[PDB]
Structure formats: C-alpha cells, structure tokens
C-alpha cells in the first residue's frame, strides 16, 4: 500500500501512434532525468486506451533506460518506438 512500485505501458505503437502531451523530464524539474507526462489528451491512442497518465515516470522505451535525460530526450524514446509501444515506467507521484 505505497507508491515506488514500477509499471509498463504496451499500447500498439503501429496502426496508431500516442498522445499525450508529455514535459518536465529535464534533469532539473523531476528526480534526476526521468520523464513526468503533463496529461493525456483526449486524441491520440494513448488516452483513448489510457496506458499512459499524468506524470507518468517513464523510465524506459522498449527497452531503452530514460534514467539521466530530458523530457524531450523521452519524447523521442516514447515517439521513436516502431512495432508495439512497450513502455516501463513508474507509478508517478503527485506535486505535493
């Protein structure tokens, strides 16, 4: 019953792409350089599933480790996926 505990996003990164509208990441905002999404917007794949949510803490992208990068640096990683999107974030916190 606390928070910490990891999880992944498989939505299909192919027939259909994300969207949410992601920020923070920056090494100065957040932890160290993990990604925080701003919220999930109501058209792309991702909040019509609803894998992803807000400040989600994604810390990879079908394997590739975001520890230590930028918001835009995930943007790529969570964009540039290709097949599936197999993404293994963190149960992300809230601002207080």
């Not at 990164?13 to 905002?29: A, C, P």
């Not at 999404?37 to 807000?54: L, M, T, Y």
């Not at 930028?70 to 290709?82: D, F, M, P, S, Y």
């Amino acid at each position: 019953p606390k928070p910490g505990d990891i999880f992944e996003v498989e939505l299909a990164k192919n027939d259909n792409s994300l969207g949410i509208s992601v920020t923070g990441g920056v090494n100065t905002s957040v932890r160290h350089g993990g990604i925080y999404v701003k919220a999930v917007i109501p058209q792309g794949a991702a909040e019509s599933d609803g894998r992803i949510h807000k400040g989600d803490r994604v810390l990879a992208v079908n394997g590739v480790s975001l520890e230590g990068a930028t918001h835009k640096q995930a943007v790529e990683t969570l964009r540039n996926t290709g097949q599936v999107v197999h993404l293994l974030l963190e149960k992300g916190q809230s601002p207080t």
